[PDB]
Design a protein around this ligand. Structure first.
Ligand SMILES: [Cu+2]
Ligand SMILES: [Cu+2]
Ligand SMILES: [Zn+2]
Ligand SMILES: [Zn+2]
Lengths: 151, 151
């Protein structure tokens, strides 16, 4: 696949549409999310594209290389760690990321997995408690969607 | 990828959870759909896992081999043609399908595509008209969901 899309929905007002495109050897992530509180929100690819229990059955971060959580720029990060998206005054976050670890095919493929937008800022694995090394203290899953093949 | 799951949702009362498991060279499809009118309903894998416009953005049946519409037991069928599911008087259809053409990996992989349950019975390509050979005359998309990787 060269293009993927994900529609984020949850139990509150958070909603959004993320597009994924393979450009060269990398993947470009674009889109926008509305209904968010102002500030940073953890944005990650969770392992399972299972929405049987809402965002909860999405499991933990996609991590085929079995590393600890980190920011998008660290070496020690989960493949699913895309950092934070930032909502403005109006609750709108515009997504514009380029990432070297996720893919739309092969072992690092995120097609069929779940994009999750979190309630709090991701601390990038530097919070200092065990939880930081797992989820960055990003908190609850406000909205999520299964990543599908797009036209 | 040996297991997948799909949660079907739409704008009406139809809902369901479909599970997929690779067994030998086949995919075993199980689950249930509720809120359906009694009788047969076409059940197919549509090409895109794009839910930006509901079930409509899912595109047509998944047909990598450029064949016409048929029933699951036909040689001339789309890879996404799984036939019909049957809802009882209470509106519940129990799904139990074994299929050798769809797959959870490789070229015919349905991971990231869309499972759709339709309003009318699928005529299996034997309706006598032209639509019969494209869609089985299954009617509207009652509920759909993106097929994701399951634990
Ligand atoms: Cu997360
Ligand atoms: Cu169909
Ligand atoms: Zn992580
Ligand atoms: Zn068909």
């Amino acid at each position: 696949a060269t293009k993927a899309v994900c529609v984020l929905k949850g139990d509150g007002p958070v909603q959004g549409t993320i597009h994924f495109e393979a450009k060269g050897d990398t993947v470009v992530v674009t889109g926008s999310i509305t209904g968010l509180t102002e500030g940073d929100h953890g944005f990650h690819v969770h392992q399972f594209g299972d929405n049987t229990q809402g965002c909860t059955s999405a499991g933990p971060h996609f991590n085929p290389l079995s590393k600890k959580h980190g920011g998008p720029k660290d070496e020690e990060r989960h493949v699913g760690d895309l950092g934070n998206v930032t909502a403005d005054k109006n609750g709108v976050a515009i997504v514009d990321i380029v990432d070297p670890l996720i893919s739309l095919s092969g072992e690092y493929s995120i097609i069929g997995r779940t994009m999750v937008v979190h309630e709090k800022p991701d601390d990038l694995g530097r919070g200092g408690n065990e939880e930081s090394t797992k989820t960055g203290n990003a908190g609850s899953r406000l909205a999520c969607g299964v990543i599908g093949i797009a036209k």
